[PDB]
């Protein structure tokens, strides 16, 4: 069975309920133990978490769930009422999703969307009463960064001040997203480089701040 589902069984078996440090700890030991590159790891977490906390957001939205460990980082700092959708393309990811996010006890602060982005971002103002989104964490398919981007401006689902975090925009690359927000004044963009202690490399974060039609 698949990575995601023994990275759930490993954190049920051993990690304390309702204690997201300790659910993010599992996931991160294990797949260290492991040596699976697939995790978002604790040094990209530690931006996540300025990120998060410097802008706090009433509605997030994230692209891409897997074991739902950015779902409980993010959670885990979404302040009183702040709620967090999630949406996944695997049907069973999203199910360890939830199941993680039950044993972290956030399963009250985020929804689970389940579908392709593309199908999905055109419906969260009707079928689920978005007005605008406050922050988006795009860590999904590299190939959508950019048409999910431009999806979300054509929706009018981003404001002045709405705050894009795009993870691995270097490592596999997201070229034609960086291009983009880099290029527009749209957007006001920051680089945040981040080591990859396995793969021994340099990846990267981008934060990029919509100004609104421009
Ligand atoms: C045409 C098209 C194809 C695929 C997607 C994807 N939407 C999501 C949430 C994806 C994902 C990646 C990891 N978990 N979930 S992939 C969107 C549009």
């Avoid at 700890?25 to 995790?39: G, L, S, V």
């Avoid at 393309?89 to 969307?113: E, H, R, S, W, Y």
């Amino acid at each position: 069975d698949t990575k995601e589902q023994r990275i759930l069984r490993y954190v049920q078996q051993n990690a304390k309920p309702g204690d997201p440090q300790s659910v993010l700890e599992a996931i991160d030991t294990y797949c260290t133990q492991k040596e699976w590159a697939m995790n978002v790891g604790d040094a990209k977490g530690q931006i996540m978490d300025a990120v998060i906390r410097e802008y706090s957001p009433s509605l997030v939205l994230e692209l891409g769930a897997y074991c739902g460990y950015s779902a409980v980082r993010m959670a885990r700092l979404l302040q009183p009422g702040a709620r967090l959708l999630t949406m996944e393309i695997n049907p069973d990811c999203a199910a360890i999703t939830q199941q993680m996010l039950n044993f972290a006890g956030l399963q009250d602060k985020v929804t689970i969307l389940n579908g392709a982005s593309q199908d999905l971002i055109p419906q969260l103002k009707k079928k689920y009463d978005v007005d605008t989104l406050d922050m988006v964490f795009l860590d999904h398919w590299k190939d959508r960064y950019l048409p999910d981007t431009l999806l979300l401006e054509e929706c009018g689902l981003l404001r002045k001040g709405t705050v894009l975090l795009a993870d691995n925009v270097i490592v596999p690359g997201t070229p034609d997203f960086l291009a983009y927000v880099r290029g527009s004044s749209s957007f006001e963009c920051t680089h945040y480089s981040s080591y990859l202690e396995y793969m021994k490399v340099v990846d990267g974060l981008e934060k990029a701040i919509y100004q609104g039609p421009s």
